[PDB]
Amino acid sequence: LYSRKEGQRQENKNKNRYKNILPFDHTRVVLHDGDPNEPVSDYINANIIMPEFETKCNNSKPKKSYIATQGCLQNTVNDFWRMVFQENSRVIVMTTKEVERGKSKCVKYWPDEYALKEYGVMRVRNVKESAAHDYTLRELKLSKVGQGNTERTVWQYHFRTWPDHGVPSDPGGVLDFLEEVHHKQESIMDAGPVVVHCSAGIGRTGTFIVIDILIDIIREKGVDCDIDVPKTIQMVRSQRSGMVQTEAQYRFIYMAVQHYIETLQRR
Helix, strand or coil: CCCCHHHHCHHHHHHCCCCCCCCCCCCECCCCCCCCCCCCCCCCCEEEECCCCCCCCCCCCCCCCEEEECCCCHHHHHHHHHHHHHHCCCEEEECCCCEECCEECCCCCCCCCCCEEEECCEEEEEEEEEECCCEEEEEEEEEECCCCCCCEEEEEEEECCCCCCCCCCCCHHHHHHHHHHHHHHHHCCCCCCEEEECCCCCHHHHHHHHHHHHHHHHHHHCCCCCCCHHHHHHHHHCCCCCCCCCHHHHHHHHHHHHHHHHHHHCC
């Protein structure tokens, strides 16, 4: 029995970018510490994605997990930073421009270059922006206003060259990007889930997360390991509905997996 009841509540209606794209109750990110003046303060349109494989062992838990979320709305920016803080996330993957084809996809939820901004009780300083070819890396410092020993670096990997229609015609850029994200995440002791967002939090987000999951398997278990793309996609869809939206996205996943395997072989 699945449900999306919290997302459907009237107190949360302005917190969803699309009225019928909602988080499953059983995997939604529940925000425990917010503004007691808000009718509901525990809601964000976001789900934890935990890779689940029939052959997982008895530990806590998968090596990497993700938060799949929508692009911020002006009124959910403070919620977004509460989520990042609460979950101890240290890496954010933004897969859209702020505006594409004249349409806002995500509000700018981070400060201007070298600026600092307060978002509710959260304080963020933009320390540095480094532009690579397909992406910009922003080094952010996140802390809870008033509290000592809460500051932590959050690395925002902003992929900027996804085409306005369709998907990249070659997956090399996305794979190089994910390799950097992978190494940053492992460089930070006990970092929380990697936050990944697009606009609705399902199409591009699902494409990036499913590739990262498959690549993580191949990076570890080798070129000859068993890969089942449809089963991995269904596994992720059990945790957030609609992950991977189009035929081009679905095929892009296959192309990326094949490309990654090819890269390793050439070494």
